[PDB]
Scaffold this active site. Structure first.
Site, PDB file in Angstrom:
ATOM      1  N   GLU A  26       0.464  -0.983  -0.140  1.00  0.00           N
ATOM      2  CA  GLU A  26      -0.140  -0.312   0.516  1.00  0.00           C
ATOM      3  C   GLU A  26       0.693   1.085   0.133  1.00  0.00           C
ATOM      4  O   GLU A  26       0.569   2.120  -0.990  1.00  0.00           O
ATOM      5  CB  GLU A  26      -0.734   0.174   1.667  1.00  0.00           C
ATOM      6  CG  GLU A  26      -2.083  -0.724   1.194  1.00  0.00           C
ATOM      7  CD  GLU A  26      -1.506  -2.427   2.296  1.00  0.00           C
ATOM      8  OE1 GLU A  26      -0.317  -2.506   2.044  1.00  0.00           O
ATOM      9  OE2 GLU A  26      -2.663  -2.775   2.958  1.00  0.00           O
ATOM     10  N   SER A  28      -5.786   5.627  11.533  1.00  0.00           N
ATOM     11  CA  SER A  28      -5.552   6.113  12.557  1.00  0.00           C
ATOM     12  C   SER A  28      -4.800   6.751  13.441  1.00  0.00           C
ATOM     13  O   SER A  28      -5.052   7.224  14.382  1.00  0.00           O
ATOM     14  CB  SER A  28      -6.078   4.539  13.192  1.00  0.00           C
ATOM     15  OG  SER A  28      -4.859   3.502  13.688  1.00  0.00           O
ATOM     16  N   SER A  35       1.660   8.994  10.448  1.00  0.00           N
ATOM     17  CA  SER A  35       2.604   9.131  10.543  1.00  0.00           C
ATOM     18  C   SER A  35       3.246   9.649   9.333  1.00  0.00           C
ATOM     19  O   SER A  35       2.688   9.916   9.051  1.00  0.00           O
ATOM     20  CB  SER A  35       3.076   7.142   9.686  1.00  0.00           C
ATOM     21  OG  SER A  35       4.146   6.843   9.841  1.00  0.00           O
ATOM     22  N   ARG A  90      10.161   6.933   7.721  1.00  0.00           N
ATOM     23  CA  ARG A  90       9.337   7.394   8.157  1.00  0.00           C
ATOM     24  C   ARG A  90      10.551   8.174   9.325  1.00  0.00           C
ATOM     25  O   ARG A  90      11.036   7.502   9.676  1.00  0.00           O
ATOM     26  CB  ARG A  90       8.326   6.238   9.054  1.00  0.00           C
ATOM     27  CG  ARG A  90       7.498   7.453  10.032  1.00  0.00           C
ATOM     28  CD  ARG A  90       7.459   5.766  10.785  1.00  0.00           C
ATOM     29  NE  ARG A  90       6.267   6.480  11.955  1.00  0.00           N
ATOM     30  CZ  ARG A  90       6.225   6.530  12.825  1.00  0.00           C
ATOM     31  NH1 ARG A  90       7.797   6.647  13.518  1.00  0.00           N
ATOM     32  NH2 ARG A  90       5.374   7.052  13.605  1.00  0.00           N
TER      33      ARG A  90
END
Ligand SMILES: CC(=O)SCCNC(=O)CCNC(=O)[C@H](O)C(C)(C)COP(=O)(O)OP(=O)(O)OC[C@H]1O[C@@H](n2cnc3c(N)ncnc32)[C@H](O)[C@@H]1OP(=O)(O)O
Ligand SMILES: CC(=O)SCCNC(=O)CCNC(=O)[C@H](O)C(C)(C)COP(=O)(O)OP(=O)(O)OC[C@H]1O[C@@H](n2cnc3c(N)ncnc32)[C@H](O)[C@@H]1OP(=O)(O)O
Ligand SMILES: [As]
Ligand SMILES: [As]
Ligand SMILES: [As]
Ligand SMILES: [As]
Ligand SMILES: [As]
Ligand SMILES: [Cl-]
Ligand SMILES: [Cl-]
Ligand SMILES: [Cl-]
Ligand SMILES: [Cl-]
Ligand SMILES: [Cl-]
EC number: 2.7.1.33
Lengths: 363, 358
Positions: free
Chosen positions: B131, B182, B185, B197
């Site tokens: 993804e 949720s 990041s 990240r």
């Protein structure tokens, strides 16, 4: 142009009052002769008692001994009483004729304005109001410059979250500049302090102690900070928060994330089933963890942006006990990958009152 | 050159996104040499905007005059809800898609759920893709081609003043990408083969919904966001002006800045008179203001001046986006804008299509 004795500073809170007093030890025979009775008895009243009326308390363990204040040698004393006793204090100011020694009294604190007219009408004193943050910072730096009777003023925690290993350790760095101060009341202000005469508020967060209390009252039906903490100490936040290990089965190395890191605060509460069985104690703890972990993150990022390695935590949010402090300690270590510690101060809560005293010497 | 047709799919929990490259330079002889199965699928896709019961082509998002693997044509964006997925797979079987390709590039957290039905019903193997990789490649690809001579990227001016609010366009590397699911990041994207990240926060969409449900008795994102849209957070939060009677002049902190999120809720009287919509709105404002701050600080830490926001937390109601826009504006003192992307939602599908050429 040295102001005459006695030298006091005050911090009048919404609920708590702090008073600091400098006791001169170097009073000449000539001075002792020319000194008025009013002064002599306040000085003896202050120094021969450690309890004052119903509620006044002198914290003898905090006394700074053998320091210099505006060129005089003596000791600094730290006194406290609740704001409800304030009318009695002002009445004491009148009975002991304080206005004959000074026309004004330096005070900071969010409660001060409430009492300004009583000071004038009852004691014939002008309350001279000062900024909370300037007083805090000046008081902090002064106490740090004089030390805590040859011991460190600053401390940190080793292995904060493990009560089997948690230990308060002193931190004796003589030169505190530059430092970052994280002041946590209802909201949070973060200040870079480069010297005594050079500091600035860099940023802050609205997610503070009042968010913690506001949210717990709403979520748990408690009414005070003491209740909120007592629940937040018995709780388990992992029931409320979704963790990385709940999403990935363990660490997620791709993102450098350990399993025990929170993925989403309050994430379990998206499920109706889980909301319907959650404890008041778990909600409170989750609320506290969310706020402390977030403050640690913001403090870490600011420390990097400002190239400052010392991060000092103070404020109302840290009183009663050490739950708050140990979670901030954990958070700072987490976000910094072990490179930064949360530092705390022994005289926390009295710095406002010390900064107010120091105002007397501004000329 | 891979054979036509060229599709990419992102199959999510509630929505499925499909992108399709329509070639516009087919020779008279290519047209003569093409099988009937292909010709009629192309005609079907291009002559319709409604497909079956629930399928929609969003012509507003169409990119025209693209070149893709050396063919000139248009990219089309299509969606339908996940519950129509059985019908989509049957459509592939009835229209004999497996005679054109044996495989189809798909991403999304439901590419696994439907792999078996694709094989058994449509004789098609799903080539499942990551993804995040698909999101980045698609986003970067769409930003590189632009939106028909206009920027892919936009921001809101005067976001919280409806009488003044203007969606304005913004004309690349590195950028921070704030991906809000949720949690949140934050990724630094230095080029199309390097992103890492850099940090994030656990205070995101999940926290908003969980706290809303607990505070108001609502149950869903759609409901929490509708309430948050209607409410007034200033009843719930303590503002700087509540404490200082205006700006905190000493440090130049605006009276309108929030001093303490949920700070008024320390008062029993204030709690007993607050509306649930006000709580909902305060929950959202708290979360977005905070995300704004962390994103701003991260931009500073990284020396990156371009901050893009994406994720399912933005799709349900435009309120989230306007609050983020205000936040970035506040924390940066006007130096950084919250950037949003016109084709948000479809990047995964675009990334999947792009895999066809690698
Ligand atoms: C777009 C955006 O807005 S993003 C958000 C950005 N906001 C900011 O950066 C500001 C963040 N907040 C801050 O910096 C701080 O909250 C400040 C500087 C504004 C105020 O400092 P605080 O430490 O929060 O103030 P403090 O906790 O003392 O509250 C002030 C006074 O209010 C009163 N008060 C405190 N608690 C209560 C209560 N429960 N009920 C009623 N009054 C109270 C008290 O008199 C208190 O004074 P005291 O602590 O001396 O007794
Ligand atoms: C002391 C402290 O803890 S301070 C807190 C520190 N914590 C952090 O910094 C983390 C903050 N949170 C975040 O960064 C994000 O929430 C993340 C990266 C953890 C999770 O990403 P989110 O965008 O929130 O995803 P979300 O939680 O919404 O859903 C998880 C997705 O990951 C997917 N996933 C699970 N395993 C894998 C995998 N192996 N590979 C790829 N994706 C996977 C799940 O299936 C799910 O996909 P879906 O939405 O299609 O069903
Ligand atoms: As002096
Ligand atoms: As220190
Ligand atoms: As190609
Ligand atoms: As962009
Ligand atoms: As608008
Ligand atoms: Cl001095
Ligand atoms: Cl400043
Ligand atoms: Cl203090
Ligand atoms: Cl979806
Ligand atoms: Cl997308």
């Amino acid at each position: 142009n040295r102001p005459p004795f006695p030298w006091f500073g005050m911090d009048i809170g919404g609920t708590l009052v702090k008073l600091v007093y400098f006791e001169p030890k170097d009073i000449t025979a000539e001075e002792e002769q020319e000194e008025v009775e009013n002064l002599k008895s306040i000085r003896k009243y202050l120094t021969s008692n450690t309890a004052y009326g119903k509620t006044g308390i002198r914290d003898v363990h905090l006394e700074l001994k053998n320091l210099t204040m505006c060129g005089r040698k003596g000791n600094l004393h730290f006194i406290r009483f609740p704001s409800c006793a304030m009318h009695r204090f002002i009445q004491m100011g009148s009975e002991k004729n304080f206005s004959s020694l000074h026309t004004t009294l330096c005070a900071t604190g969010g409660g001060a304005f409430k009492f300004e007219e009583d000071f004038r009408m009852i004691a014939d004193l002008q309350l001279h109001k000062l900024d909370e943050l300037d007083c805090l910072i000046q008081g902090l730096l002064y106490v740090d410059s004089v030390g805590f009777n040859g011991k460190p003023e600053c401390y940190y925690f080793e292995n904060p979250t493990n009560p089997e290993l948690c230990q308060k350790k002193p931190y004796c760095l003589d030169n505190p500049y530059p430092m970052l101060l994280v002041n946590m009341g209802s909201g949070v202000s973060i200040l870079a302090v480069y010297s005594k005469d050079n500091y600035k508020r860099v940023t802050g967060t609205s997610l503070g102690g009042g968010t913690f209390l506001g949210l717990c009252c709403l979520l748990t039906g408690c009414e005070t900070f003491e209740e909120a903490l007592e629940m937040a100490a018995k709780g388990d936040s992992t029931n409320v928060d979704k963790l990385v290990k709940d999403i990935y089965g363990g660490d997620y190395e791709r993102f450098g994330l350990q399993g025990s890191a929170v993925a989403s605060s309050f994430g379990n509460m998206m499920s109706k089933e889980k909301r319907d069985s959650i404890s008041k104690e778990d909600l409170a703890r989750a609320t506290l963890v969310t706020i402390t972990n977030n403050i640690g993150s913001i403090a870490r990022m600011c420390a990097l942006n400002e190239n400052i390695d010392r991060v000092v935590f103070v404020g109302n949010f840290l009183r009663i006990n050490m739950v708050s402090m140990k979670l901030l300690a954990y958070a700072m270590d987490f976000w910094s990958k072990g490179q930064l510690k949360a530092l705390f101060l022994e005289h926390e809560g009295y710095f406002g009152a010390v900064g107010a005293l120091l105002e007397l010497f501004k000329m």
